[model samples]
Target: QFVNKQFNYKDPVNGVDIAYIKIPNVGQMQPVKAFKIHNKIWVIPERDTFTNPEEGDLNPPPEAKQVPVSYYDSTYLSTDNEKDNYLKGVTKLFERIYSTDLGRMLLTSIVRGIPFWGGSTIDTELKVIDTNCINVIQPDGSYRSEELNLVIIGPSADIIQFECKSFGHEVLNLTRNGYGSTQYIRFSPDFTFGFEESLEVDTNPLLGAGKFATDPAVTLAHELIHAGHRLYGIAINPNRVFKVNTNAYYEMSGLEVSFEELRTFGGHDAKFIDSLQENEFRLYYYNKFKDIASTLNKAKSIVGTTASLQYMKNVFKEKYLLSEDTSGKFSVDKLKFDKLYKMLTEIYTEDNFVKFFKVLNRKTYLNFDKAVFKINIVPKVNYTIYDGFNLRNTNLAANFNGQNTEINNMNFTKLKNFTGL
Candidate 1:
């Protein structure tokens, strides 16, 4: 009765090169070693479960025989090959994760070690001497030659000598057996503690998944952003400056005051910025900045909704990018950096800036001077442009910047820039 009547020829394994295949409405087809297919059923080898030791365990004592043990033939799968493959898979997975622009930036900028600048050392005639691949024997009987030095002993060696001679003289003399000479220059323990703080993840509840949601590269970017703000006293938003305060409030009025003062004062100096306690002001400002921007974005989306309940639903949906009718959530891959950049840009735009600021100010507290707010607004507008531009460019620099020597050179420039004050 069928108009297109034809014999159906099916190959279970698709072709000679194919190992397995799927039939139209049936499941996958596994080839039988020594049998022919009939009635579309696969006559494969029967699985045999031998009474043996459990997987990941070899043998059991007689007393432990009551416990059930599962085992499989090691020969069935290539253990060495699988192990290699598993490790390779994990390596590739991590590489892929860290290869992300955000991930790569975080790893190099945050997780990598910096020079230690803490302990005292002996004094010697300091010069810019290159070791040039020469081997130096260690107390452990191991020779070290090409060990990478993240921080070279700079002109600060003079300061270190002063401290060693002034305060650590007794300790140095004891170690040197009263042989006081400038031949062996001492160094204070490399002040590397700041590096750890720079890389340390703040586990504040306000940070939420954003804290752990990043890879080393992304972490580096975020931390570097903070470092830029702290070290340069440059506001990311340009129009706003954040002050150094131990007990700065997070509510709108408090933040607005802090922001206005800093903005008006042309931002605080980097030295004062660095001296401030870790969570004293910067962390609060950073988190609040992010929160306010996120909140304002949500408010903009709920301008028109018939019912209050529908408006509330739309607010959550717009804020978190969720759907009310669907149980599904958007994947991280769906969130593009460009979208984030544009969203932030729109919030900081001159046309929208005052309105956005006032909205946030009023939401937190009904009392804020509407007229004085315009004075705090950033004028040039290049600041907004630069924030996104700097992030994108710096992220690229952190990624393809080459091996040890290039990194050292770049690091030297970073230090110089910071030291220049």
Candidate 2:
């Protein structure tokens, strides 16, 4: 599999000798003096040259042309409200969801797994429509709310609509948003409620009625599980569902219980829940919530997670921050990490709700773990400074005047075969 070739050269004017070496795997051959061009001697073949005629012509293959996707500004609110205020509120919500550690993890997990259309050559378009006026007719011809915000039209003629709705209680309904390969995300300002005292009672009426003093951290984590389902195509099962939704669902009573009860009940099936409960109880008994929080903080240390989340937050700020001038450049540096730590500690330490959710969505946990661990690191070279400088720079050095006067019309083809192997 080697192309055998050899050449000899004699400088007609100076009679200088030249030599080179070539091997099967290595392509080119050059003179020994060529190594003097750089202090660190290394052979690098001219990758652009050395073509094989039998390897087929270099003409590009005929294929369907790709169109680039375009992004447009679409407002999704009533014209009656102050546009700035409405945008600000929605933007604030987006920032809060995306800026948090859990939020960052969710976005990272989704983008990594899904084939997103953003920044691609496919000329897909995104439109923001009025949530109230636009009715997305479902496959069943059912119509949903008009306040749906985001819509994407892809090159494959696929349409996706996204809706963010508030249920008052921490309970979110992903189904309210119309479908087109669409996604609906529910956002509740309060903490997710624990299992009710009675399984027969419907929690819908009690939603948004009062602050349930539930854990925001756990609620956010559960919501992220739903996002994972939509983005990663991970199906939710009882065990996997619990990892994101810590509440226990009782099929016999048609009731859901608080995370604590869910853990106790889950212990009957999964032993891991028991261990998690035991560790949490020990931490609580020792009054080491601070220590527990510190340990969970390691999740923040995950590289690219925080940066990716911050980028999402910035996108929200660009779209919605209340003060067009003031809030536009909202910085993550302004956020207090201590507050986040406290929130997480309050959610996870006493009840271990978030961990319970993790157990519920074990598949997502495992997949996200794998995805985060698979990031690649690339090495690059720096080319800045140089060695040696002349005390007086000549015009020839600056303008390359007469630099190759003697070799201006030299026959390079004659020299090409001079170095032999």
Candidate 3:
């Protein structure tokens, strides 16, 4: 019932042929060479975290012989017809933020940019890049368009000078690992000024830092932005994650850093508007997808529940009242962002489909000799044997208004391997 290699294009505006794919293992998705979060910790394919480094380190530093790939090749995803009016300005920015809070919890942020992951660049230089193709679907019954990469064999392997930065911390640490550190920091001493020693309000306050064992991580960043904008889907869950905005935290919190720092600082932070929040998918809950195995139980404190403190108060009403490029650089009190947006519109009113878990059972930065945010509900990720899907809806992205792209979906078998005929 499935098979794909996918190729086609004609919509020179609307001529309509549009089908696309790219995955010769040039894009670091080589059948997800590694995965298994919250249980074992085998971690790899954070786009293979810099392929072939094996730097268990016996002075093994310089073997990167002429090693500068300038990544995102996972065979260079394409169809970039020069952005095709950039997909009608991203479907008119998802129809003006769900046409103004009609359903109550617009909590928003499917945060993406069109041929835009390569936004933040680094160079080791071999030079030859240009990628981006936009959406396609409603064509099925045959199901095509497929591409995936990951070839790390013999010599110059490839770590991830790729997208969304963080290949090494470059070593800043930030207490050993909160999602692998450095998504932009400044207050130092592990984010001073205190909210309770703040590593995002001292951990687990009902999902402060982007909860993900599945179902959070913005529900895999809203179905990887409707399966990477159609035609064989993909844009994130390329995997790797970020947090906080100390002092410079988007210039005094105009809010918006954490589309994994807008894919590791590539969106050049104008407060990554248009989308990506929930602590930028809480850096997959402590880098390497929220560890349980490698030896970090994670969580210092935080328990407030009323739907997790209204998503930590929509990360402080989009960094103090919807950041227009950091409006007045923060002193905190634009009527306290209009009194926490009328106290989260009277605690989210859809007859409160909200068990309203702790809209204030309230707890923060507590450990109390070790209760550490209580830990339980986390299991949902078998990822259906890779190439994931079953997103259902965490605001939207089940093929985002157009479907196709299936190799058994869920991120094409957890990142691609074993195609079809």
lDDT (CA) per prediction: 0.22, 0.24, 0.23
Model 3, span 1-421: residue lDDT tens: 0101112112321112332222221333223222111111111212222222353222324545532112122221123431222222222222222333421133222111111111122321111112221122224423222211111111112222222211222222211232211110000000001112224433322223211112112221222222222211112343333334432433343432333224322212324323354334333322321121111112122232222423422332342232223432213333443443333322222222112210111121121111111111112241211112232443223422101122112321122111110
Cα deviation at 343, candidate 1, in Å, is 20
Residues 187-282, candidate 1: write the lDDT tens digits: 111111001111111211122111011111121222223322221112233343443342222342243333322221121222222335423443
Better of 1 and 2 by lDDT: 2
Q: What is the TM-score of each candidate against the true structure?
A: 0.17, 0.24, 0.21
Number of the top candidate by lDDT? 2
How high a TM-score does candidate 1 get?
A: 0.17
| Top-TM-score structure, candidate number | 2
- Candidate 1 wrongly placed segments (more than 4 Å): 1-87, 110-112, 117-120, 123-278, 281-421
Report the C-alpha lDDT of model 2 over 245-276, residue by residue, as the tens digit.
32332243233233332332232322334456
Cα-lDDT of candidate 3: 0.23
Candidate 1, residue 151: how far the Cα is off, in Å: 19
